[PDB]
Amino acid sequence: GPGSELPQMVQQLNSPDQQELQSALRKLSQIASGGNEQIQAVIDAGALPALVQLLSSPNEQILQEALWTLGNIASGGNEQIQAVIDAGALPALVQLLSSPNEQILQEALWTLGNIASGGNEQIQAVIDAGALPALVQLLSSPNEQILQEALWTLGNIASGGNEQIQAVIDAGALPALVQLLSSPNEQILQEALWTLGNIASGGNEQIQAVIDAGALPALVQLLSSPNEQILQEALWTLGNIASGGNEQKQAVKEAGAEPALEQLQSSPNEKIQKEAQEALEKIQ
């Protein structure tokens, strides 16, 4: 676009009129969706403060589009995620989790999910800003797109270190996640299994928490899914749980995993057939 495109957009973020504001937001989103180097160009131009400022907008539309812009920036490398955090976006994003506006909620979850796709300490900034209780509550949303986006944010957080895992457990996520294992929405099963498997990649007592929330029978049932991608996430999760100690192993046996796993030997998908064998030996 023109060589002077970026400074002009950044200056329009301080425009009195909504029409000019929205054009700058659409354009900055478009630039920031073209890879890390273009995101950094946007950051170096000074966009973050006016974007954060706009999270306090009275206007539904701008807030939504500002969130989307910020979301795109946070999809960059760790350095770029940290710049979003350093610009003070978190306290406002966390407040926006109590919003009853669905598009706003969806774009705030997206941004926080991206931030949580970072290093362990940007995961921890999200936790320290108080995001978890609200996030967990949204696993109960009737609106499956809010729900999908909350699960993806929790999953990213659960993919951190063991204290990240622990914080997810202490925020009360296990019962709502185990519940979502009954979901016939495949993207929700996929995200909930992935989140459970991340939590199950922790210590033994973290695995035991997953066991005690009653995950195993639904997990074993999902070994019969005709959807290969759900089959794949369930195996991976069950795989992580079987990687614990003796009583974690013992619980998976008790849950009937064995003929589900044997029955997966006859599978066409060699990745599936191998992993299946691996969890089979991997108990006892």
Tab-separated table of C-alpha atoms in Angstrom, residues 49-158:
chain	number	residue	atom	x	y	z
A	49	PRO	CA	-1.617	2.458	23.271
A	50	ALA	CA	-4.493	3.721	21.090
A	51	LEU	CA	-5.731	0.173	20.566
A	52	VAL	CA	-5.757	-0.494	24.311
A	53	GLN	CA	-7.332	2.927	24.919
A	54	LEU	CA	-10.163	1.766	22.588
A	55	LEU	CA	-11.033	-1.281	24.728
A	56	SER	CA	-12.810	1.330	26.891
A	57	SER	CA	-14.892	2.468	23.944
A	58	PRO	CA	-18.608	3.118	24.511
A	59	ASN	CA	-19.234	1.918	20.926
A	60	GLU	CA	-19.878	-1.820	20.568
A	61	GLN	CA	-18.485	-1.885	17.070
A	62	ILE	CA	-15.134	-0.284	17.662
A	63	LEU	CA	-14.483	-2.354	20.808
A	64	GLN	CA	-15.158	-5.503	18.763
A	65	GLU	CA	-12.833	-4.433	15.931
A	66	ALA	CA	-10.153	-3.120	18.301
A	67	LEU	CA	-10.192	-6.501	20.013
A	68	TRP	CA	-9.796	-8.227	16.688
A	69	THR	CA	-6.854	-5.989	15.790
A	70	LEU	CA	-5.113	-6.725	19.123
A	71	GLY	CA	-5.890	-10.463	18.695
A	72	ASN	CA	-3.958	-10.370	15.399
A	73	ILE	CA	-0.956	-8.645	16.925
A	74	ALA	CA	-0.882	-11.199	19.824
A	75	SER	CA	-0.763	-13.955	17.235
A	76	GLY	CA	2.870	-13.014	16.589
A	77	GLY	CA	6.044	-14.163	18.363
A	78	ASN	CA	6.592	-14.065	22.167
A	79	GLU	CA	8.169	-10.561	21.899
A	80	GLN	CA	5.041	-9.269	20.265
A	81	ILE	CA	2.758	-11.006	22.756
A	82	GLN	CA	4.867	-9.281	25.561
A	83	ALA	CA	4.338	-5.853	23.874
A	84	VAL	CA	0.560	-6.396	24.020
A	85	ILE	CA	0.956	-7.279	27.731
A	86	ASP	CA	3.339	-4.370	28.405
A	87	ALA	CA	0.730	-1.987	26.807
A	88	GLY	CA	-1.591	-2.939	29.648
A	89	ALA	CA	-4.177	-4.872	27.598
A	90	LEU	CA	-4.825	-7.652	30.182
A	91	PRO	CA	-6.868	-5.876	32.876
A	92	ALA	CA	-9.329	-4.660	30.185
A	93	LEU	CA	-9.521	-8.042	28.421
A	94	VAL	CA	-10.304	-9.763	31.716
A	95	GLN	CA	-13.107	-7.266	32.450
A	96	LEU	CA	-14.544	-7.977	28.965
A	97	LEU	CA	-15.078	-11.648	29.958
A	98	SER	CA	-18.174	-10.433	32.023
A	99	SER	CA	-19.610	-8.877	28.864
A	100	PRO	CA	-22.997	-10.112	27.656
A	101	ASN	CA	-22.167	-9.059	24.076
A	102	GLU	CA	-21.254	-12.300	22.192
A	103	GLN	CA	-18.932	-10.874	19.461
A	104	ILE	CA	-16.998	-8.919	22.046
A	105	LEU	CA	-16.638	-11.997	24.213
A	106	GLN	CA	-15.500	-14.020	21.245
A	107	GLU	CA	-12.729	-11.566	20.211
A	108	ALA	CA	-11.606	-11.023	23.830
A	109	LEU	CA	-11.260	-14.846	24.229
A	110	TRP	CA	-9.335	-14.940	20.967
A	111	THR	CA	-6.872	-12.261	22.038
A	112	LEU	CA	-6.323	-13.899	25.479
A	113	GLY	CA	-6.025	-17.279	23.834
A	114	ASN	CA	-3.236	-15.896	21.605
A	115	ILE	CA	-1.515	-14.267	24.533
A	116	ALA	CA	-1.662	-17.656	26.305
A	117	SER	CA	-0.149	-19.343	23.195
A	118	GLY	CA	3.081	-17.710	24.349
A	119	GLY	CA	5.798	-18.696	26.794
A	120	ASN	CA	5.111	-19.848	30.297
A	121	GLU	CA	5.377	-16.352	31.712
A	122	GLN	CA	2.905	-14.828	29.358
A	123	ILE	CA	0.584	-17.708	30.272
A	124	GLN	CA	1.216	-16.711	33.906
A	125	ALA	CA	0.485	-12.962	33.209
A	126	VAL	CA	-2.976	-14.139	31.960
A	127	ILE	CA	-3.515	-16.125	35.206
A	128	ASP	CA	-2.236	-13.276	37.467
A	129	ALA	CA	-4.703	-10.859	35.772
A	130	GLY	CA	-7.541	-13.138	37.079
A	131	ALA	CA	-8.752	-14.603	33.795
A	132	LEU	CA	-9.429	-18.139	34.960
A	133	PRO	CA	-12.665	-17.969	37.033
A	134	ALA	CA	-14.494	-16.119	34.253
A	135	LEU	CA	-12.988	-18.462	31.607
A	136	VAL	CA	-14.184	-21.554	33.448
A	137	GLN	CA	-17.625	-20.059	33.789
A	138	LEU	CA	-17.793	-19.744	29.978
A	139	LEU	CA	-17.394	-23.471	29.490
A	140	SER	CA	-21.070	-23.445	30.577
A	141	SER	CA	-22.147	-21.099	27.834
A	142	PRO	CA	-25.085	-22.287	25.641
A	143	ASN	CA	-23.383	-20.416	22.780
A	144	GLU	CA	-21.051	-22.980	21.267
A	145	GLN	CA	-18.793	-20.396	19.602
A	146	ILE	CA	-18.112	-18.674	22.939
A	147	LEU	CA	-17.609	-22.109	24.354
A	148	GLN	CA	-15.151	-23.132	21.536
A	149	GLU	CA	-13.080	-19.999	22.045
A	150	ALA	CA	-12.993	-20.353	25.888
A	151	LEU	CA	-11.831	-23.946	25.552
A	152	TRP	CA	-9.076	-22.960	23.162
A	153	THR	CA	-7.890	-20.225	25.591
A	154	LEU	CA	-7.922	-22.767	28.521
A	155	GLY	CA	-6.123	-25.322	26.498
A	156	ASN	CA	-3.323	-22.870	25.670
A	157	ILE	CA	-3.057	-22.080	29.414
A	158	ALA	CA	-3.099	-25.766	30.325
